[PDB]
Design a protein around this ligand. Structure first.
Ligand SMILES: Cc1ccnc(-n2c(S)nc3sc(C)c(C)c3c2=O)c1
Ligand SMILES: [Fe+3]
Length: 309
């Protein structure tokens, strides 16, 4: 009995709120655990996501001085690496994000502005998300070029640490790659692959996602550069990923899909992509191995998924 998936973009409304209601910020472990103001702020961002419906403007939020400071620290620290460590695509778009989107140490960009910018670049759009969605639900969004995106910021006591996605990771890690057409097509391919796929393949796709969108390296002429959002938003790991320490292997999906990984330390191993067009082709070949009694394609004119046989 084939798993349901949205067939229109508005149908992402359906399971968008089906998050893990009891989130990371509730653990005694969390940098913000003892902070009741932080607790409430987090629920505030969650209620914004909860009430969001596809098509609406994303609500603007006045960030606090404390939050802007945390952003500032993440921004300045990370900025110092991008020219040398980040891929061309990243460095190419970053100044535009500064000019048109207010990417600056003193200013946390608003999601609506960033979403409009991306729509202009590649048709990618943002949708605020409360918390952790299933891989199935999150990856499905990508098929429509929709990135489920957090709006809250990490707790101010630890600006270099987040166990979770937060706004810094989304804007400084993901957003600049979603501005590139080739990357955008690649990421969407992973989304298309996920539609109606068995649970076992959702997990293989999530693993591929992690070794690409989150922790991917790519060839850049004779050199290698970072493009994964998890690398680009981690000061420590961004420098480490391109030192002699980690092991590097070519992106190869039948191996990548089964490779184990942990979230708590630096990756002992990275996969290197030839280019985003090549990763896309590889994902397209891999999707053909997924037992699905149909074929899918996205029609951007009507914003619907076409389902054949
Ligand atoms: C597949 C999927 C579905 C929903 N969210 C995610 N997701 C994304 S996009 N970025 C990050 S950064 C970090 C430290 C974590 C844990 C995390 C994460 O979980 C991934
Ligand atoms: Fe991420």
């Amino acid at each position: 009995t084939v798993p349901w998936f949205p067939r229109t973009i508005q149908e992402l409304d359906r399971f968008a709120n089906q998050i893990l209601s009891y989130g990371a910020e509730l653990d005694a472990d969390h940098p913000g655990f003892k902070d009741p103001v932080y607790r409430a702020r987090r629920k505030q961002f969650a209620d914004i996501a909860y009430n969001y419906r596809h098509g609406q403007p994303i609500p603007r939020v006045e960030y606090m001085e404390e939050e802007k400071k945390t952003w500032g620290t993440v921004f300045k620290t990370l900025k110092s690496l991008y020219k040398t460590h980040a891929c061309y695509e990243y460095n190419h778009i970053f100044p535009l994000l500064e000019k048109y989107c207010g990417f600056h140490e003193d200013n946390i960009p608003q999601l609506e502005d960033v979403s409009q910018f991306l729509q202009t670049c590649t048709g990618f759009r943002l949708r605020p998300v409360a918390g952790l969605l299933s891989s199935r639900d999150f990856l499905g969004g990508l098929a429509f070029r929709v990135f489920h995106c957090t709006q809250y910021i990490r707790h101010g006591s630890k600006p270099m640490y987040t166990p979770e996605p937060d706004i810094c990771h989304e804007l400084l890690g993901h957003v600049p790659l979603f501005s590139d057409r080739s990357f955008a097509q690649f990421s969407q391919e992973i989304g298309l692959a996920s539609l109606g796929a068995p649970d076992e393949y959702i997990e293989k796709l999530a693993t591929i996602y992690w070794f690409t969108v989150e922790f991917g390296l790519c060839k850049q002429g004779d050199s290698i550069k970072a493009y994964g959002a998890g690398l680009l938003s981690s000061f420590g790991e961004l420098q480490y990923c391109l030192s002699e320490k980690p092991k590097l292997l070519p992106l190869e999906l039948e191996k990548t899909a089964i490779q184990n990984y942990t979230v708590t330390e630096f990756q002992p191993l990275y996969y290197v992509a030839e280019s985003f067009n090549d990763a896309k082709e590889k994902v397209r070949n891999f999707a053909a191995t997924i037992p699905r009694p149909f074929s899918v394609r996205y029609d951007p004119y009507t914003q619907r998924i076409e389902v054949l046989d």
